[PDB]
Symmetry: D2
Subunit: 390 residues, 4 copies
């Protein structure tokens, strides 16, 4: 009966779209967190048996190799297999689940899960360039916005959040208060130095610039800042604004996992063990509540209940769906995203699931809790959830 343990977890600070990480490609963001995660774990790259990375937006040809490039350039041996996965907003946690699966099934004893996303460097496509437009204006397709639209109905993820706000009765006022609180919690967490340990600096080159602070957060935010904003996604009876929706963002993160008995052998104290995970599909139009069935599956499989959870990282894609999720599961809002989430810290799509796992495990240790839940909604109508035990 094999068990997966997490031995280290690290992330970059989360850059804003067009911001501090604009000039750093996903491959380099991924290699950075891989190298630093291995160092933190005191594990040689020669001993890694599998690498899985999450990523949604291919920014360049190397991104088709992202898992391999982040692995090898981060010092993982060329003898290790390397995968890239795409479950959209869930990709980062999927990477960690896929990597854990290779350990559980005995394929290897040591693996790395992570994610990297650069929404700053998202490309435009030219779909007529290969075979020609012949006659008539042609398109340059924004592939970032592509990621943010449902593939069946071609609506923005934000209008899907309006559907969820409607169905679960989450008011504008509730969304804006949740958004304000996320910024307040994030700001408090940055100032109290909660993120210091888990963040790897990115340094670029008067002199050297080092980016190590989550730059999306608004430290001086007020409720009127929220309430003055206009709905962006829908024309009538709208509630979702730029202020109470997640940002567009750059980041990466990675965790090193290994089989329980490997960690013991090496004398490594784990951050936590993986208890269970769950996946769900839901209506594409209501993708924001994906976490509800996924979390229930993970709880069931763990033999746990909501009250058992000490720390919850449930990505704030939009305050609309985030409020719906906590209401529907009956979560205590004080335990959910205690240090902020997508609205305040940002939502770097394919990295997010890996980076909020990193947050959850460091927070779990900080408060000496027992159980952590990590869960997020997924574009196209899905949810993913995992539960960890310290």
């Amino acid at each position: 009966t094999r068990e997966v343990v997490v031995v280290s977890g690290v992330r970059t600070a989360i850059g804003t779209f067009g911001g501090s990480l604009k000039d750093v490609a996903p491959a380099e963001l991924g290699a950075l967190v891989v190298r630093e995660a291995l160092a933190r774990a005191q594990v040689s790259g020669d001993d890694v048996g599998h690498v899985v990375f999450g990523n949604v937006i291919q920014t360049e040809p190397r991104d088709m190799y992202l898992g391999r490039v982040a692995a090898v350039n981060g010092g993982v041996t060329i003898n290790a297999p390397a995968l890239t996965v795409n479950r959209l907003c869930g990709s980062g946690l999927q990477a960690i689940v896929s990597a854990a699966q290779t350990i559980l099934l005995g394929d290897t004893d040591v693996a790395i899960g992570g994610g990297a996303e650069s929404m700053s460097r998202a490309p435009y496509l030219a779909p007529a360039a290969r075979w020609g437009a012949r006659m008539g204006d042609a398109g340059l397709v924004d592939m970032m916005l592509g990621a943010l639209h449902d593939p069946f109905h071609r609506i923005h993820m934000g209008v899907t959040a309006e559907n969820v706000a409607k169905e679960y009765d989450i008011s504008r006022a509730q969304q804006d208060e949740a958004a304000l609180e996320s910024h307040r919690r994030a700001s408090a967490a940055i100032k109290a130095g909660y993120f210091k340990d888990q963040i790897v600096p990115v340094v670029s080159k008067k002199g050297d610039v080092t980016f190590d602070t989550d730059e999306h957060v608004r430290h001086d935010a007020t409720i009127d800042d929220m309430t003055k904003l206009r709905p962006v996604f829908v024309k009538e009876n709208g509630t979702v604004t730029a202020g109470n929706a997640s940002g567009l963002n750059d980041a990466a993160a990675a965790v090193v996992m290994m089989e329980r008995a490997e960690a013991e052998r090496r004398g490594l104290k784990p951050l936590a063990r993986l208890v269970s995970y769950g996946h769900a599909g839901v209506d594409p139009k209501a993708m924001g509540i994906g976490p509800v069935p996924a979390t229930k599956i993970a709880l069931e499989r763990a033999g746990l209940q909501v009250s058992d959870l000490d720390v919850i990282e449930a990505n704030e894609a939009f305050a609309a769906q985030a409020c719906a999720v906590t209401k529907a599961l009956g979560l205590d809002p004080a335990k959910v995203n205690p240090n902020g989430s997508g609205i305040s810290l940002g939502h770097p799509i394919g990295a997010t699931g890996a980076l909020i796992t990193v947050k959850a495990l460091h927070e779990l240790n900080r408060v000496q809790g027992r159980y952590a839940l990590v869960t997020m909604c997924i574009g196209g109508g899905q949810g993913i959830a995992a539960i960890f035990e310290r």
Copy 2:
């Protein structure tokens, strides 16, 4: 001890670059094979618990959702989770492995693995479009060629094949004979109707595409030998004739836990015995199958001689000949009905579609064990072993 069994497998015919499938997006290719695979299995889309699809080249925004779009539009329930994976040339077999893993770990009893790729519809990128080029000529980046270049050294997969031909002593004459044979085998197989069952027609009065159009039915050895090396200036062996084509296709298999299939009274095509992954030198990616296959054999408690049918993707005759030599495979059993050189190499779909080929061939000859394996750009290999019935 849960066991994964394959209950159906289907593929499109393989289109040529700029050819019969030029106007059909990966999403639609994927939905087609998903629908038809489920029908063949006599399984309702309502009963599918996971879907994983392989794909390397994003041709449009929907391709970021490919697994989910191919699932739902193929009649899988919205309640099923859906994943897209990318292990380059191995993506299609990886999808089948990831889907099987969800069964093996008890996450579900019914899953679909597949792949879809449209190299015809591979985009150009404009990386300066968002923030501007400002001054000076800018690039439109061919993302198909992007897929075919090593990400460390920026060399074509084909120069990697030259390295392998050099290291394992595979001559130009070998490679051209192997290429000619692949075409001959593929042609024979098409004419004898071996592929008829496994191929789902794509219909666009109508044109209906159901025959693998890359194959050259009239090929001669002088066709090969007159060709010039394409990938290296000097001392080259690898040509357009003895390298794999650029191609469009999809494929999908429906898998379920052994006891599910029994419950349903379904006769499986085969069971999954084992799989193996390896990394290798990026510069010698073509021999990735060798360590991967050895891992799979070890895990299965098998040896080479146990294998009745082998699908080992011909990315280039150079590496394909090296793989069979290094493993000591019998060339008669390897790619008996052609492979990437003759049928084509639709990157992300290939691993799923040669699994489909392997299983139908295994049943045709009433063999016991099948190996599916392929080399992977960037220096990897992936292999799986199946057993009939």
Copy 3:
């Protein structure tokens, strides 16, 4: 002494179809070809040319910003000669000839070349967001050929402008389709009787396949019937439309050039001119009715020449659309037998910036063939203009 401009030679390429025989030949090379061959036909050295003006609307590559200079120098004109590119849209090619003539009339030089070159096959797409970035949201690749064919004030196709003029001047669908059929018939007859043989310079492309020579106007339909026209649907408007692909001009590639010189400089050289320039005229009209631009322009030219319509033996009046071409002849009271007697834009094609030069070449050779006295060349111009010139043999 009062100076006079005479045309001593005129040549054109055959007119290629969009995506057709001239797809792989840039304007610069089309221009250099007609310059070289015009000079040869005139028996004039490139060393003796004092000015070159070329018409061109669509810039296909960076060299096209230099077109007049590149066509001049690569055609064997001395580097010492000034060289100009002009753009009056559909009129550019006649404007080039007018501007070149003006340099002679004002005594700036004694020898000049007017021409035009256009490759609508090689028209580019623009990316206007590329330089400074789109930032967020889908961006555009702008089809600059279609750009040339839309009015800059109202962003309507030239063809909807032709619908306006069909409406105002009462030119019926039936009239337009008959005019279109007749243009093809006239063009076909002219090609077969060899009328164009002398004026056409072959374009020969050498390649890994040996030599290909293009010397026949490939837009013309030699087997056209009236039911070919009548079965077509209106393309430019979605109610009450009359203008179709069949009775509108084609999209086309071509070049042409004429060598002009002061009357006394031809006599000196013992050259027999094709014709002299008598007068020219320019007009502006409503952009929405641009097709009738020729009417006021032609009246100005006739006035300045002290002539009337009955004096004209040959008329090249570009068929941009049968709709406006019929309106122009009706409004001026022209005799349809004398107007575009060997076809025009509908049948032979409309290579925008070259067209005015190439129908001047047609007019002067036809004038000589029938031993007429006076030729009128005129055409409508996008954005609401006309241009006209009158020549005497």
Copy 4:
């Protein structure tokens, strides 16, 4: 003997590449100067008989119609013919010459010559987009740089300037001193308000922004700013830098001309009359000295000599060729570009010839001089020159 007189001249301030005019299309720049030139002349747009505009870089489809769009949107009647011309760097002065020709030959009594260029909004082309690239990386072609490369030899204009510096013995030290002086002269001229009258504000839209000062000029320039710069255009033995070459720039300008007897009829006091013009072709590799033969032609045709000239606007494309031109013609440097030129104020290609005509005529009136020369070199190997007299 019909005579052409200039009754008004106006320009925009010259914007820098990516600068204050980055969001204003050539069509709008052109319409603005047309409207304001007509107002200054006290002439109705209904009375204009011809419009000609210079432009080299098509930035959008409307730029194929530029003359017509600048005319009509500037309030010129739709009944007026309208032309766009391209003689590269000379286009602006060519537009004024072509317009004057329509008057001289009796086609009309009132015409407008101008130029407009937006190098900020120069496009990228995608030449594979129409018919397809098929396989392999494809190009986005920078059309601004396209304008700045010779079409025979595909060398930058700047390497052509190195050839001229070499042939006419103009040292790095000479070029840098000339560059510094151009900035000093421009700065002095801006501060003393010399340009105030001729400049039409561009006001665009956190409320309204008004641009009315030539923003390329460096008011604090020193010689060690020049001398620290490295040659940009050639590998070895280079003298031409970013500091002593002209800028990339946006602008427009226009002048209203009419037949002498029309102006008298209207009781308008002209700025000047056109005396003569001249065109020359030269070696493409030495295009920078185009002005020399063109100016000699214009002087000959006018029956004038160099000493007759009180004000000279001879575009500084590069200090290398600008110094060569003045040396070869034996011009007095004090009279040449007395208030700066392309190095300091900028070089908005297709507008430049119009806008330095505007400068020349206003300067000629300011100093109560008699004769002005306007001349500039032209890419591909040409020159153009015109001479004006203040009556």
